[PDB]
Amino acid sequence: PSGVEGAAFQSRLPHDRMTSQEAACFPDIISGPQQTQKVFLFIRNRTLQLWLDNPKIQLTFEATLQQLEAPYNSDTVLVHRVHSYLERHGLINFGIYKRIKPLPTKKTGKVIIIGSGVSGLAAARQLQSFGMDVTLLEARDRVGGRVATFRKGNYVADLGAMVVTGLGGNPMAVVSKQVNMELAKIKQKCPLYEANGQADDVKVPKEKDEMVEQEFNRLLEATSYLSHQLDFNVLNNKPVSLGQALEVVIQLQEKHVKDEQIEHWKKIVKTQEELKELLNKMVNLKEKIKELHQQYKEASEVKPPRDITAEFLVKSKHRDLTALCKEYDELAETQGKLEEKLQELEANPPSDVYLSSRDRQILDWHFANLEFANATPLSTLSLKHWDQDDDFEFTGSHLTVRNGYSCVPVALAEGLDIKLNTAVRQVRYTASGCEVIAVNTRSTSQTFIYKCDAVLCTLPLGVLKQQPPAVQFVPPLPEWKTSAVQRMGFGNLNKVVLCFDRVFWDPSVNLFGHVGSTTASRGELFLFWNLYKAPILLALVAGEAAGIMENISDDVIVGRCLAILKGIFGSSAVPQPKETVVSRWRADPWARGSYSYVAAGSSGNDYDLMAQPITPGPSIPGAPQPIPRLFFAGEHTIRNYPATVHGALLSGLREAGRIADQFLGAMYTL
Amino acid sequence: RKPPKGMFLSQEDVEAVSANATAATTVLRQLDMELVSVKRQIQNIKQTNSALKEKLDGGIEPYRLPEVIQKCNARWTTEEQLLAVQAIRKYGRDFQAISDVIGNKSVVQVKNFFVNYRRRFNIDEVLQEWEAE
Numbered sequence: 006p007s008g009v010e011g012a013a014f015q016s017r018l019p020h021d022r023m024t025s026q027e028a029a030c031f032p033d034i035i036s037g038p039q040q041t042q043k044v045f046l047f048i049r050n051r052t053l054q055l056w057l058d059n060p061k062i063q064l065t066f067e068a069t070l071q072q073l074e075a076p077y078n079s080d081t082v083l084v085h086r087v088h089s090y091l092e093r094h095g096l097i098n099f100g101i102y103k104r105i106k107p108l109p110t111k112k113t114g115k116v117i118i119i120g121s122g123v124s125g126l127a128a129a130r131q132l133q134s135f136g137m138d139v140t141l142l143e144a145r146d147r148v149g150g151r152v153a154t155f156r157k158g159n160y161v162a163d164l165g166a167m168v169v170t171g172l173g174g175n176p177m178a179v180v181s182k183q184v185n186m187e188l189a190k191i192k193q194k195c196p197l198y199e200a201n202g203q204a205d206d207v208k209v210p211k212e213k214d215e216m217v218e219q220e221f222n223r224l225l226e227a228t229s230y231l232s233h234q235l236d237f238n239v240l241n242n243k244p245v246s247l248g249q250a251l252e253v254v255i256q257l258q259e260k261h262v263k264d265e266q267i268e269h270w271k272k273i274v275k276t277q278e279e280l281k282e283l284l285n286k287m288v289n290l291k292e293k294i295k296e297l298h299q300q301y302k303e304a305s306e307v308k309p310p311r312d313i314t315a316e317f318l319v320k321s322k323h324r325d326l327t328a329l330c331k332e333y334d335e336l337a338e339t340q341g342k343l344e345e346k347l348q349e350l351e352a353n354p355p356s357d358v359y360l361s362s363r364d365r366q367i368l369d370w371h372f373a374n375l376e377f378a379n380a381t382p383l384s385t386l387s388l389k390h391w392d393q394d395d396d397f398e399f400t401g402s403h404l405t406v407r408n409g410y411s412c413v414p415v416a417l418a419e420g421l422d423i424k425l426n427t428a429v430r431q432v433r434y435t436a437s438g439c440e441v442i443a444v445n446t447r448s449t450s451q452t453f454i455y456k457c458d459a460v461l462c463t464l465p466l467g468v469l470k471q472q473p474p475a476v477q478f479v480p481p482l483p484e485w486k487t488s489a490v491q492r493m494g495f496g497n498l499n500k501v502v503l504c505f506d507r508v509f510w511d512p513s514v515n516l517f518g519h520v521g522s523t524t525a526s527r528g529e530l531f532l533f534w535n536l537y538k539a540p541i542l543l544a545l546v547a548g549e550a551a552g553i554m555e556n557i558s559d560d561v562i563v564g565r566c567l568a569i570l571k572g573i574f575g576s577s578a579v580p581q582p583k584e585t586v587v588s589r590w591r592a593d594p595w596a597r598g599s600y601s602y603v604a605a606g607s608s609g610n611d612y613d614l615m616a617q618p619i620t621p622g623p624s625i626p627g628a629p630q631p632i633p634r635l636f637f638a639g640e641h642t643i644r645n646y647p648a649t650v651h652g653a654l655l656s657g658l659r660e661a662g663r664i665a666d667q668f669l670g671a672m673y674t675l
Numbered sequence: 676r677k678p679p680k681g682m683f684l685s686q687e688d689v690e691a692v693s694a695n696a697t698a699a700t701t702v703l704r705q706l707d708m709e710l711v712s713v714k715r716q717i718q719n720i721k722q723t724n725s726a727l728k729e730k731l732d733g734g735i736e737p738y739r740l741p742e743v744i745q746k747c748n749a750r751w752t753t754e755e756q757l758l759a760v761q762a763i764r765k766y767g768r769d770f771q772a773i774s775d776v777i778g779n780k781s782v783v784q785v786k787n788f789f790v791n792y793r794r795r796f797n798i799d800e801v802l803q804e805w806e807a808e
């Protein structure tokens with residue numbers, strides 16, 4: 006889009022209408038005259054545009070009002086309210102910006118943030134830019150969390166997040182402007198390489214490739230029809246998974262393949278019956294004729310002169326014989342065109358099979374690839390909900406961080422009170438405030454204690470899931486929250502980094518698949534990635550496979566890799582690798598997995614439960630309803646942008662606003 | 676809106692393949708057997724009709740009568756009158772056959788004949804004799 010409207014879209018907001026959030030804080034306006042709303046919207050939109058057109062520096066209220074024309078620059082409580090609201094909910098002045106008005110001399114309110122993930126770091130920056138006192142507690146020796154980036158000499162490779170899923174509406178657009186964030190495109194072409202029991206692997210031909218991909222997509226689309234139109238979502242009391250539905254859709258396709266074959270051969274026979282019951286009349290005529298010819302012959306050898314009865318006998322029999330030589334010609338014609346119509350039918354069979362083996366193994370790659378993107382076996386994805394975030398996807402081709410994604414959390418962590426090697430062990434929250442008990446990760450006996458007005462928890466969903474708990478809540482988190490954690494899904498997927506000295510693959514190719522034999526291990530090293538001038542190939546593990554490869558040694562895993570690469574590029578042309586790295590996300594205790602997914606039996610509504618903060622019981626019973634003390638951000642809290650970097654980022658910005666609103670009041674409903 | 680092009684999925688089918696824990700591969704095998712049964716039954720009538728075409732081997736040339744056509748004359752000869760009467764006895768009303776038996780009388784002439792001579796050749800008596808068969 007173009008204009009002020011394009012700022013709105015780019016900020017994930019409808020240029021032409023007020024959001025429920027805005028209605029919350031501007032009820033006067035939205036209940037009011039149409040006219041005033043359209044003013045508001047322009048103001049909002051314009052103010053955003055400004056932030057965006059230069060987001061390396063803060064936007065003040067004055068700078069904003071400066072750049073307005075009447076009638077918009079006329080009412081200036083409205084302009085001030087708006088600017089503040091935006092500022093608060095990180096729509097403007099977030100990320101890394103040069104401050105115009107240096108910070109509040111003294112800080113109001115104290116917050117402890119658990120985890121220096123991106124969700125954390127973002128909120129922290131906001132809170133501090135709102136002049137609260139903020140301290141982050143990270144168990145790792147480094148920021149970013151699930152934004153890991155391997156480095157050694159000039160060999161750089163992301164073990165954690167790596168892809169910006171389009172700049173169109175992405176807040177990372179803003180960040181990529183506030184940091185060099187060196188952004189490469191991803192060339193979408195992916196050639197596939199099927200094994201052969203050890204025989205050289207042959208690439209798949211473009212005919213196959215294209216056909217199978219299309220079946221796959223068609224199969225997905227199918228599951229969707231299956232879900233919505235047929236309403237196939239429970240099964241023996243248990244919610245239907247996507248994998249479950251895919252099987253069912255495949256079977257039904259193989260069934261149909263047969264039912265065609267059957268009614269085709271049954272069409273053949275029902276003709277054969279006609280042919281058979283014709284051939285019988287034709288035999289039974291030829292017999293009546295043989296006899297009748299003889300009879301005529303005998304009556305024709307009665308030598309003349311003859312009396313008239315014996316004359317009539319000839320004429321009679323003569324006629325009766327040309328009568329049957331008539332009929333046998335009708336039948337002989339019919340015979341001819343049934344036999345033609347029979348080779349017709351036996352020329353045009355219906356399909357032999359739905360999918361061969363060689364096909365169904367390639368399809369299993371397209372499935373592995375989906376199990377990768379979603380970080381979980383399709384047996385676990387909710388049929389009804391797995392694709393719910395699909396309407397909020399950004400626009401523009403997907404990109405990569407060339408210089409390594411860690412650049413970002415690092416940049417965010419500039420000027421923040423971050424306590425690394427600090428493992429939180431217990432969270433206590435009460436009407437009067439909260440205290441947080443941590444330890445030193447190295448000597449665990451060395452204990453820490455932090456008192457604060459409010460706690461923000463960016464602990465990963467896998468951590469929140471640990472049984473027995475890694476972090477204890479005091480008091481315990483309510484039914485509704487724990488149940489929600491129980492229900493949600495937290496997946497897994499791993500990356501293998503292969504450092505070489507010399508670039509043995511095709512340099513102009515970005516990414517290329519591998520097609521193992523069985524379904525059972527479809528995820529295992531199913532895909533490889535190239536990027537920098539650096540001789541790094543990345544190998545991906547997904548699906549049921551990724552969980553099992555964590556119990557297998559780096560060397561065996563690096564083996565299984567090379568073997569695959571040899572069988573493609575030639576046993577001589579594939580060096581041993583200089584540096585190898587393997588992720589183990591499900592076993593890494595500060596993540597306990599890769600990222601969330603919509604488990605069967607969950608819904609998007611759980612993501613909203615996860616964000617809902619906790620308010621303790623009152624200290625002195627019958628004393629007034631307390632303040633909400635314990636908050637939650639993180640990738641698993643953002644219904645519409647889950648399992649991503651931008652998702653976390655936003656969840657962070659979001660809590661910061663909620664907290665500030667709570668502890669520093671709202672100057673923008675004043 | 677509706678199942679992708681060429682993907683098949685009836686309400687009925689789904690209930691049926693879901694119904695049990697392996698009513699999936701029941702139904703798929705039930706049809707594999709159903710199929711061979713019909714391929715075997717084909718191999719059979721192919722073999723049956725195969726024999727019956729060997730019995731028609733030779734067509735019916737050995738029994739075909741050459742083609743005689745004389746002009747369709749107008750006059751009723753006594754000879755022709757009698758042929759007719761006998762034909763009637765053997766054929767009933769089949770004017771077509773009767774015309775062919777006589778040779779040189781059209782199917783109208785034959786039809787007229789019926790009504791003129793009707794009196795003198797007691798064709799009433801004759802035609803009910805034919806029905807007594």
Ligand SMILES: Cc1cc2nc3c(=O)[nH]c(=O)nc-3n(C[C@H](O)[C@H](O)[C@H](O)COP(=O)(O)OP(=O)(O)OC[C@H]3O[C@@H](n4cnc5c(N)ncnc54)[C@H](O)[C@@H]3O)c2cc1C
Nearest residue numbers: 120122124144150151166167168429595599639640649650
């Ligand atoms: C392999 C992989 C690839 C990915 N790829 C992409 C991608 O390509 N594109 C994309 O957009 N997104 C991707 N993601 C998702 C993205 O990485 C995350 O969603 C994002 O980093 C989430 O940030 P967070 O703050 O919610 O959680 P985290 O980043 O985990 O941060 C939470 C922090 O809490 C810390 N912590 C844990 N336990 C404790 C404790 N007891 N005490 C103190 N601190 C603790 C952790 O160490 C961590 O630093 C990927 C994730 C994975 C695993």
Ligand SMILES: COCc1cccc(NC(=O)c2cc3sccc3n2C)c1
Nearest residue numbers: 167168170191377378403516648649650
């Ligand atoms: C058209 O894109 C092709 C392509 C090629 C290689 C990798 C990916 N995607 C990811 O690695 C990925 C993106 C995102 S967003 C949240 C998680 C996640 N993951 C794991 C995508």
